[PDB]
Amino acid sequence: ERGWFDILDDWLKRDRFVFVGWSGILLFPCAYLALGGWLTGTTFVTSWYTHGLASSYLEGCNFLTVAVSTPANSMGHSLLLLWGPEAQGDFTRWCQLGGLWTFIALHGAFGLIGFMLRQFEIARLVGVRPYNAIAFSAPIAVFVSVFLIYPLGQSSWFFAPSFGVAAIFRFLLFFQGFHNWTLNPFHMMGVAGVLGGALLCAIHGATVENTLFQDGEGASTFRAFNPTQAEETYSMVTANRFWSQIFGIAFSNKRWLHFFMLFVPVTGLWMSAIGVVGLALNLRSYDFISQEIRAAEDPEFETFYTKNLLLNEGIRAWMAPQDQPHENFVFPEEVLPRGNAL
Amino acid sequence: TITPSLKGFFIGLLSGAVVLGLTFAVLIAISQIDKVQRS
Amino acid sequence: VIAQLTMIAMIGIAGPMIIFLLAVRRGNL
Amino acid sequence: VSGSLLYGNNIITGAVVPSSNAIGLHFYPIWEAASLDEWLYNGGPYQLIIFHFLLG
Amino acid sequence: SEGGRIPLWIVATVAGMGVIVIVGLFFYGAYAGLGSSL
Amino acid sequence: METLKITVYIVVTFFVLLFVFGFLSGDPARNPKRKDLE
Amino acid sequence: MTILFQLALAALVILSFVMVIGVPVAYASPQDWDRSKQLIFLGSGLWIALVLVVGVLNFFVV
Amino acid sequence: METITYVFIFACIIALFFFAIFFREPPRIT
Amino acid sequence: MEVNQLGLIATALFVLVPSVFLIILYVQTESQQK
Amino acid sequence: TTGERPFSDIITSVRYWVIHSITIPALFIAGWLFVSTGLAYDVFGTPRPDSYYAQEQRSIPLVTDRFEAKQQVETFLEQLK
Amino acid sequence: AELTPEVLTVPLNSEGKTITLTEKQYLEGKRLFQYACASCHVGGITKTNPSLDLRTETLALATPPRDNIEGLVDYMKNPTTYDGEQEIAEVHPSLRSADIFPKMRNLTEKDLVAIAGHILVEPKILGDKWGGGKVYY
Amino acid sequence: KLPEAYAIFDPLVDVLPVIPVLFLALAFVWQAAVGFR
Amino acid sequence: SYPIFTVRWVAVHTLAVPTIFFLGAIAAMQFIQR
Amino acid sequence: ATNRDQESSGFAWWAGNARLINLSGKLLGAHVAHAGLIVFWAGAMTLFELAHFIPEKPMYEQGLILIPHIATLGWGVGPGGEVVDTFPFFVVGVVHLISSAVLGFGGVYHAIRGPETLEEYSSFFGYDWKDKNKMTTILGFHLIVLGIGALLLVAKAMFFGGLYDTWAPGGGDVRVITNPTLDPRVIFGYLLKSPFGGEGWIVSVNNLEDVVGGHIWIGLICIAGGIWHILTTPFGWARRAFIWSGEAYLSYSLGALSMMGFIATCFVWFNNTVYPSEFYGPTGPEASQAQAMTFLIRDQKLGANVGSAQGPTGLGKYLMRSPTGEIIFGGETMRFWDFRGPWLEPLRGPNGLDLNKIKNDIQPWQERRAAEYMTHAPLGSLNSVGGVATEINSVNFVSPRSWLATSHFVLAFFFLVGHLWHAGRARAAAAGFEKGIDRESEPVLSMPSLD
Ligand code: CLA
Ligand code: CLA
Ligand code: CLA
Ligand code: CLA
Ligand code: CLA
Ligand code: CLA
Ligand SMILES: CC1=C(/C=C/C(C)=C/C=C/C(C)=C/C=C/C=C(C)/C=C/C=C(C)/C=C/C2=C(C)CCCC2(C)C)C(C)(C)CCC1
Ligand SMILES: CC1=C(/C=C/C(C)=C/C=C/C(C)=C\C=C\C=C(C)\C=C\C=C(C)\C=C\C2=C(C)CCCC2(C)C)C(C)(C)CCC1
Ligand SMILES: CC1=C(/C=C/C(C)=C/C=C\C(C)=C\C=C\C=C(C)\C=C\C=C(C)\C=C\C2=C(C)CCCC2(C)C)C(C)(C)CCC1
Ligand SMILES: CC1=C(/C=C/C(C)=C/C=C\C(C)=C\C=C\C=C(C)\C=C\C=C(C)\C=C\C2=C(C)CCCC2(C)C)C(C)(C)CCC1
Ligand SMILES: [Ca+2]
Ligand SMILES: [Cl-]
Ligand SMILES: [Cl-]
Ligand SMILES: [Mg+2]
């Protein structure tokens, strides 16, 4: 066997500066287009016709406020292909209709797939276990649930996050006001996994860095390590005693420690993805029923929960008309919920 | 009948086949010019 | 405005000039 | 504002409520109150807990 | 042609100053014309 | 409530004094290596 | 006195610039240190002098 | 009853901390 | 409060069943030969 | 090392800078002109500052139909007189 | 939409006479307004007294009328309450009180005309936003 | 404003406060020159 | 001694060329007045 | 080149200044050059502000922090804090800028030309970090120096024109302080005041007599301590309590400056005496209270009885009691009832705000002041859009109080971090394991198991 496939394989798997692989055929064009589309849009492309927003450097926006914004609500879930029935091959009109959004989301998705396949392929060639790709399943679960499943459960892509700093923030505040997303235990598990992952990252780095063996004369300790050396660079034993006496428990097993370091953030993101999947259907943790029944009958009953619902109600009424222009919301001064003075 | 959107579909199909085609042609060509040394 | 970019041009170049001249003359860098 | 479980909160809604805006930055240890009932009304537990916490 | 003719610390210094100038220009643009709020 | 106040004050002063005299108590000497740091 | 002032001050600026590049270069250069030490002394005394000149002339121009 | 449950769960967790700390399986150098 | 009246059984079984599974497994682990 | 020319060799070479002191500014100037001539607005369909609204108009030109969206946008641009 | 000669055309007086401001006068007007007035009147409302705004209709029903260049210029020299009954130069910026509102000291008549013109032009651009307050932000 | 006599130096004066940051940047230029040894 | 046009070269320029073009675009954008 | 690479020094480039720990000549160069940087900034920033300064605008509308400091000393300002002469600012700026040339000269000389070490050169200027006596001696010198500084402030206050006093009877003005408070009961009484609301520790100092008397005390204390330290060497308990190395002293100073930073943050935030609101703008409290004053005034003008006016909550819409009964502005501004300011106090009676004074005695200058401060509340965006976060672009404003408080919080915090870093390192280095654990002598391996 030495046909064209295997020769192609040979070239594809050549050890070069930027590895290519079979996965590269998916990854590189898709990633390049996703990123390029984002830069192109943020630099030059408007959201006037889709959102009634400026979103580009061209219009006077800065890096924080620039975005490639989602299509108009009236587009529904159109793939919005350049050649589709909306744009009909006209690139300018396609851009004006938000074609770049779906462009970025979909090339993005296939790009993530490509990246993970890349992780598998390289793991296979180098002969390591494929836990990096497995851990990468969490970012994918987030991207897919949030940028794809969610709007697919809503009226249109319009309500997906737009690709922009400030736009993403809007997405956060919308989820608060409308979904009370903080109250959602899947988001809470997300929080635990992210903050816990950061905690582990910091604590592990610091523990290693503060239990190093003196392996050089240099007061700067980085050179006193050799990649190929057999010995552990830091004392597991001293670290374990330290935390045991400080905190009460400690890792004693390095393999467990590091698996746990994989587990925590990956599982967190996964839980959060599940919650957002719920939000696609508006299947929220919005209320505690016992709370509403009590507060409804008893006007002296107040919790931080009821206070947060007031905040949510404000968010909805004040932001909805401009945030959802396709609805033709007109909220008279007199209907806007406001406390005293403000 | 071929509606404008079916024509669009075909245009897309062709564009994809072309992109992938030129890609595989080019990669195979390059793999053939720059063979790995064995033995 | 032209004057300001000229001032910061001389002030701005000064440091690297010190370094460049010392490097050329094999100075005590 | 009710913060405690027995007064109608669950784990997610429950809180120790911050001390009164009437106090501001005034130091409000238990002994500045005329009674525990007053201390509780104005949110003394908040100041006691967080100050001990930060020290700790 | 020959590698080493132009010292790397100068390339770095020049490139760096270039980035500072361009970014600086972007910040000037934050206060003037579109996006300046005026 | 005055008795509570005096109690707490005494307690606090007590623990603080333990802290201060404690660290004053040849703390640099309390390590597994070089003790002569005076 | 404005001519004396405005040029004494321009000269103060120019000389300042010259010292700013020249002094460290002198300090760290191996050769011509004998000539450098005297040029730095001269530049320094002249700098001090220009500061004082500008300072005095200030009150007859403001 | 809700409250009983919550406080109960919490108490179980503190007890768990206690066992997890003082009655852990000891780490051994082999 | 007008809580879900099954919240009690739900929570209780949610804690107890896996807790029990784990305790079963631990205990049968300790009694294996050293 | 993977066989490619080291980056530091390249970017410290005379020939690289002979090429790129031409190519880089040329690209920069090309982008500049892409905007300053106004071509960018036309390519991308971005409103100029004088083309967001008709003189007396205060309504956003929101696209409200999926399939006549193209026509909708054209009508909106036409209404800028 | 553009800042046309027509937009910059606002009432000079109560007798039907208009004045056409230059783009440079309008810009000067914005700058000077920000400098001297906006600390309280940002966006056309009034922070130390929100009952009174800078809406054109509101200026029209003040006494004497303030919906014209002359009215506003006179106000900036000798401000009154909304009914004309008391002179409030002592608590409101004016040329008359430049001693106590030092920002009014370098304001020239031209500056007053320009500021006035900003006050009349802005609602023609911004609509309900001018004097709308936060509801319309 | 500066006294009228000094008005010609406004642009220079406009730039001066930032020079200290330039000393920090200079330290890196210098270190670049000795190869961060 | 070294090849010039490699996969790495191509990759680098696919990012760098548009990058300089866009930055030039945006620079021009800083002088745009309404 | 001695000790200017990692192999010889043991320190990488990014820890480069540690190569200077034991090079007292070069280290002196570093220090003097750095002092040059500080004086340079004082001068250039002052000239910038002045060139940028419009005398008929309030200073705080122009982003000034240094001119406010010069002005606080009584230079260039008159009644109400009005600018009468900008020339003193010019002098301060210029003299700093010139001095900076000198410091930079000495610094650069010491850094690259001067003696790498001073010990063979001079026994007086040379030093060993572990030489405790030489250290307390140098410390003593710097203490006498600081004391002289404080007395320079006293001199400015008593004999060379005085200080700006926002509290001056009949209105703020530069005033000579003829009777500074010398009573140790009052002066150290400040040091024993609570740091919580209504006490505010040293930040509560509300009259220049106390400030000047305090600095007399501090000057004499610092000079006495300096002499003390030149004439003494550290006692046994101090020898046994501390680490004696350069990095350790560094850590101590970092800690102290951190502490001082936080103190300055609160000082510029709350105090309107040594940070007069005329120059720096209103405090947050000042402004909240100013809103309340403004609308109380407005509505009373409209015919409201502000004493008996019940708000929606049951609390007085304009006026209510503090938790100790004082009459205070009501609504949220209730938190700020500890605020004190020259524009509000005339309305103050024995029991707090006096209803009859409110009804009858409010002067137009108070309404004006309240409006100004209300609308120059210390709120604004990072790009300096004044007002609440939801306010529209229009006003180019961030209060100097915010710039100075925030800057010093960030700095004080990182200096606390630096304190921890360097104190812990001084400990590890003194004990001899700052580079890591001895593999053949791992301390924990000789310890009994925990369980
Ligand atoms: C004490 C610190 C301090 C303070 C309070 C101010 C205050 C002010 N300055 Mg001044 N300034 C300072 C230092 C300071 N400056 C210095 C050192 C310089 C020399 C470069 C200048 C130069 C300067 C100029 C040239 C001007 C001002 C002006 C102003 C005002 C506007 C500031 C601005 O818009 O923010 C913009 C905010 C930023 C640029 C963000 C800063 C964020 C930094 C990078 C974060 C720092 C973090 C920490 C220290 C780093 C540690 C890292 C960690 C890993 C260890 C404002 C009143 C302006 C003015 O209004 O004059 C009338 C004006 O034009 N300043
Ligand atoms: C205020 C900031 C500061 C200061 C005062 C110093 C001080 C100093 N550094 Mg340094 N350093 C700094 C920041 C600073 N560092 C930073 C941020 C870094 C990390 C990037 C380092 C990294 C570093 C390293 C790695 C090393 C030092 C060392 C030294 C010292 C020797 C310098 C040398 O030999 O010159 C050689 C350079 C030249 C001859 C070029 C010219 C330099 C001059 C001083 C510039 C003067 C310019 C000025 C505008 C002229 C005005 C003159 C006018 C008044 C007449 C010197 C004392 C070295 C040391 O410890 O020696 C034992 C050492 O190896 N530093
Ligand atoms: C704390 C700052 C400091 C320190 C400790 C030193 C230390 C030393 N310097 Mg100096 N130096 C400094 C700053 C400092 N320098 C500055 C800023 C400059 C620029 C002008 C110089 C320029 C300098 C030179 C050119 C030389 C030295 C050298 C000397 C050494 C001997 C000096 C002598 O014998 O004095 C004996 C005492 C006198 C001559 C009388 C001193 C009169 C003073 C100035 C009166 C005013 C004091 C006043 C309180 C200062 C307040 C300033 C404040 C506002 C900042 C000595 C190691 C020499 C050296 O190292 O030889 C190889 C050497 O030749 N230095
Ligand atoms: C106890 C020390 C102390 C204190 C509390 C003050 C307080 C005050 N001074 Mg300062 N001042 C001091 C020392 C002090 N000064 C000294 C030594 C000098 C000479 C260098 C000056 C020079 C000075 C001037 C020139 C001016 C002031 C002004 C001010 C006021 C506004 C500035 C400010 O916010 O500083 C806040 C102060 C600090 C952050 C220092 C806190 C000190 C703590 C309490 C002690 C720390 C000690 C240390 C850690 C312990 C040593 C260790 C030992 C136990 C072994 C302010 C009221 C201004 C003013 O009054 O305008 C009218 C003004 O312009 N001062
Ligand atoms: C920067 C200024 C400075 C510095 C670095 C030092 C540093 C030194 N001094 Mg001090 N000293 C100073 C100023 C300074 N002094 C001044 C101005 C005076 C005159 C008042 C003195 C008088 C002095 C004496 C009389 C003595 C020292 C001693 C010492 C040494 C050890 C002191 C130590 O353990 O403090 C740690 C402080 C304590 C152990 C005191 C108790 C700690 C309490 C609990 C802390 C409370 C403060 C807290 C943070 C809150 C502040 C507010 C509070 C007032 C309510 C040490 C070398 C001793 C020495 O050995 O002499 C050679 C010694 O006996 N010094
Ligand atoms: C007086 C204050 C002071 C002093 C004298 C020192 C001095 C010393 N420290 Mg440092 N340190 C300080 C404060 C201070 N520290 C603080 C506040 C922190 C907390 C962040 C640290 C944290 C620190 C660490 C973590 C370490 C040191 C180390 C060292 C030593 C070598 C410093 C070096 O060469 O850096 C070279 C300088 C650089 C590489 C530049 C740093 C760049 C900074 C972080 C960004 C500046 C941001 C700027 C303000 C705003 C943006 C401007 C823009 C142009 C970027 C030296 C003994 C080392 C050591 O432990 O020595 C034994 C060491 O590793 N220090
Ligand atoms: C050691 C070193 C370091 C640092 C450096 C330094 C820190 C030094 C310094 C200091 C300095 C700081 C120096 C200098 C400058 C100064 C001068 C040079 C002065 C002059 C001035 C003038 C000229 C005046 C004029 C004026 C008049 C008087 C009026 C008004 C206007 C004007 C402004 C014009 C580094 C990092 C590099 C590294 C290496 C080593
Ligand atoms: C006052 C007076 C004076 C002044 C003097 C002075 C003092 C100056 C100084 C100077 C300075 C002091 C400067 C410095 C410099 C340079 C720069 C412009 C900066 C930078 C950076 C860079 C660009 C970097 C880059 C790179 C590195 C190299 C490595 C790594 C990587 C990176 C990227 C970072 C005069 C004469 C004017 C007269 C008037 C007034
Ligand atoms: C979509 C489109 C597509 C594709 C296109 C593309 C793909 C392009 C690319 C291009 C790209 C690819 C872009 C460029 C770039 C970048 C820029 C736009 C600029 C920049 C940066 C920067 C400005 C820097 C700054 C900062 C940071 C970031 C870093 C460091 C620090 C600093 C401050 C420096 C096609 C045609 C097929 C069809 C459809 C349409
Ligand atoms: C001018 C002023 C005045 C006065 C001032 C005063 C006179 C103050 C003072 C003096 C002083 C009196 C200050 C302070 C304190 C000190 C310190 C800061 C210390 C610390 C402590 C520590 C740090 C120690 C450490 C440790 C211990 C604890 C234990 C053992 C170990 C050791 C030793 C390490 C007044 C306020 C009226 C007003 C305003 C202005
Ligand atoms: Ca125009
Ligand atoms: Cl209205
Ligand atoms: Cl309020
Ligand atoms: Mg612009």
Topology at a glance:
This is part of a larger assembly, with 14 protein chains of 14 kinds.
Chain C (H helix, E strand, L loop, with lengths): L1 H23 L5
Chain G lengths: L1 H27 L4 H25 L5
Helix pairs in contact in G: 1-2
Chain L lengths: L9 H6 L3 H15 L4
Bound molecules: chlorophyll A (CLA) (6 copies), beta-carotene (4 copies), calcium ion (CA), chloride ion (2 copies) and magnesium ion.
Organism (chain F): Thermosynechococcus vestitus (strain NIES-2133 / IAM M-273 / BP-1)
Keywords (chain F): Formylation, Membrane, Photosynthesis, Photosystem II, Reaction center, Thylakoid, Transmembrane, Transmembrane helix
Pfam families (chain F): PsbI (PF02532)
Please provide a brief summary of the model.
Chain A is mainly α and 342 residues long. Helices cover 57% and strands 1% of the residues of chain A.
Write up this protein.
Chain H: It is found in: Cellular thylakoid membrane. This is part of a larger assembly, with 14 protein chains of 14 kinds. Chain D has helices at 36-41, 44-55. Chain D is an all-alpha fold and 56 residues long. Chain L has 37 residues and is an all-alpha fold. Chain L contains two helices and no strands. Chain M has one helix at 7-29. Chain M is mainly alpha-helical and 34 residues long. Classes of the chains: A mainly alpha (342), B mainly alpha (39), C mainly alpha (29), D mainly alpha (56), E mainly alpha (38), F mainly alpha (38), G mainly alpha (62), H mainly alpha (30), I mainly alpha (34), J mainly alpha (81), K mainly alpha (137), L mainly alpha (37). The A-J interface holds A 15-17, 44-46, 48-50, 52, 56, 58-59, 72, 74-76, 78, 85-88, 90-93, 95-97, 325-326 and J 2-4, 35, 40-47, 52, 60-67, 69-70, 73, 76. Bound molecules: chlorophyll A (CLA) (6 copies), beta-carotene (BCR) (4 copies), calcium ion, chloride ion (2 copies) and magnesium ion (MG). One beta-carotene sits between chains L (12, 16, 19, 22-23, 25-26, 28-29, 32) and C (11-12, 14-16). Magnesium ion is lined by residues 29, 32-36 of chain E.
